[PDB]
Subunit: 29 residues, 3 copies
Amino acid sequence: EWEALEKKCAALESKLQALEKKLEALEHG
Amino acid sequence: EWEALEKKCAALESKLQALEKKLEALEHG
Amino acid sequence: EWEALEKKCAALESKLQALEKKLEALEHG
Ligand SMILES: [Ca+2]
Ligand SMILES: [Zn+2]
Ligand SMILES: [Zn+2]
Ligand SMILES: [Zn+2]
Ligand SMILES: [Zn+2]
Ligand SMILES: [Zn+2]
């Protein structure tokens, strides 16, 4: 249970970082 | 305390999915 | 360990909220 939650947060963090970079691209055309 | 952090992570996953849908709509629509 | 996961989840929430803000700015120009 605990190990799954930790892994879920690590996945979220990767996904958020990618989304930040994709927004930055869109911001700039 | 456990349930509260589980719910938080599920809510962040839901939000991130909604944010990616809106990004796709902005980029392509 | 629990306190570090809770800190990480709060940081992801803050991040996500920033990204939602920035997507809404792009949706309006
Ligand atoms: Ca559970
Ligand atoms: Zn651990
Ligand atoms: Zn710039
Ligand atoms: Zn707590
Ligand atoms: Zn796309
Ligand atoms: Zn396209």
